[PDB]
Amino acid sequence: FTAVGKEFNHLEKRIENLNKKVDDGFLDIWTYNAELLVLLENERTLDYHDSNVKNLYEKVRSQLK
Amino acid sequence: FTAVGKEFNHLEKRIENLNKKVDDGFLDIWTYNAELLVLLENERTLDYHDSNVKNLYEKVRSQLK
Amino acid sequence: FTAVGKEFNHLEKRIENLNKKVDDGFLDIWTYNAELLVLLENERTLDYHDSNVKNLYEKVRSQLK
């Protein structure tokens, strides 16, 4: 019977809410990383055709899904 | 009686400690983002008066509370 | 008897899996921060000998363990 109890559901929903907080926080971080990168690449600071620069685009792309 | 039991409190405190780890980790990340940004803006790399650059300051400000 | 029950172990393993997700996510973020920084420092954008620039290397080093 524990999975219908109040206490099990309290803890479960706290886990779920933390997992959501982590997902939304990671999305916020990686959206920031994307917004910064594209500005930095607008300069001669970072060149889009350098393979090390493409590595960053590819990570950001993959993180934003 | 479960909320006074040892097991419920063990799990609850693990949740709490994870939530703290997430908060402190996000604060570390966003403090880093702030420290990097202000250095990058010291250059002509990023211009503080560009509206896309202000977007980044505003996100960092909001994240650091 | 609760620590051998199914429900306690279900919640515990969810905590553990979330903690792993957080660790792996933070490592991904800080690896990205390292990869970006070293590219930015390749330019006159950021000078490795400036003490504020060394602060960033030191944080990244410490985060990657």
Numbering used by the authors:
A (entry chain A), B (entry chain A), C (entry chain A): 6 to 70
What does the paper say about this structure?
The stem peptide encoding HA amino acids 403–474 was the longest fragment (Mw = 8.5 kDa) which was efficiently produced in a soluble form and was selected for downstream applications as HA tri-stalk protein. Our tri-stalk protein is significantly shorter and corresponds to HA2 amino acids 59–130. The crystal structure of HA tri-stalk protein was solved to 1.7 Å resolution using molecular replacement technique. The space group was P63 and the HA tri-stalk protein was found to be located on the crystallographic 3-fold axis. Therefore, the crystallographic asymmetric unit contained one protein molecule. The first 3 N-terminal and 3 C-terminal residues were not included in the final model due to poor electron density. The structure revealed that HA tri-stalk is an elongated trimer with the length of approximately 63 Å. Each monomer consists of a long α-helix at the N-terminus, shorter antiparallel α-helix at the C-terminus, and a small flexible loop region on the surface of the protein connecting both helices. The central long α-helices form a tripartite coiled coil with the short α-helices packing along them and forming a 6-helix bundle-like structure. The protein clearly matched the structure of the corresponding stem fragment of the native HA at its low pH-induced post-fusion conformation.
